[PDB]
Design a protein around this nucleic acid. Sequence first.
RNA 1: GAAGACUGGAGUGCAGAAGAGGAGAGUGGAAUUCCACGUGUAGCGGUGAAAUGCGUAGAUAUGUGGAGGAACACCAGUGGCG
Length: 114
Amino acid sequence: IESGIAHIRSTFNNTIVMITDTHGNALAWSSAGSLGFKGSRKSTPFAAQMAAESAAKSAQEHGLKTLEVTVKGPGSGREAAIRALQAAGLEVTAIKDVTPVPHNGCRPPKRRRV
RNA sequence: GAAGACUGGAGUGCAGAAGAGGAGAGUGGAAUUCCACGUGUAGCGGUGAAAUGCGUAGAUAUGUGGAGGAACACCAGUGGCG
Ligand SMILES: [Mg+2]
Ligand SMILES: [Mg+2]
Ligand SMILES: [Mg+2]
Ligand SMILES: [Mg+2]
Ligand SMILES: [Mg+2]
Ligand SMILES: [Mg+2]
């Protein structure tokens, strides 16, 4: 409405972008798979470019001049989408890293190729 | 072998110090999974490439509460104790 927030999760397989309110309910979303990418083409920064553009440009109807980006996931598609959202008109107030680091909680799945 | 003597071995007392040494009872936070709720739309997941799999009974993402189990981020170092 006036100032929402943007959630992004660009893992090594996909880039999902979110736009919500400041109290945190969904408005519009897009993904690298929604644009027609089949193989591992999702993980590229360019697929994140199209996802970010198509998600920010569809947030115009809701109405938002400011937003903040919360970046989660270890993939290679964060800066691209952050810049694409910032360069569509809405200025990103601040950027945060929200990766879920555990304090040695539960054992991870076994190492690959053994 | 026997009878004595000594303190440089061994032990006791006195004054200090460090420590993931052991056993019993009780509390803490972050995170994974499950459950309920509010917008929320067509995909999510995964590989070198895919498919099986989950998803219009409406998933992923998304904020708010509840349950349970296991291991203890930084400190952390050919550091410490046995
Ligand atoms: Mg002595
Ligand atoms: Mg919890
Ligand atoms: Mg599982
Ligand atoms: Mg949920
Ligand atoms: Mg929760
Ligand atoms: Mg020793």
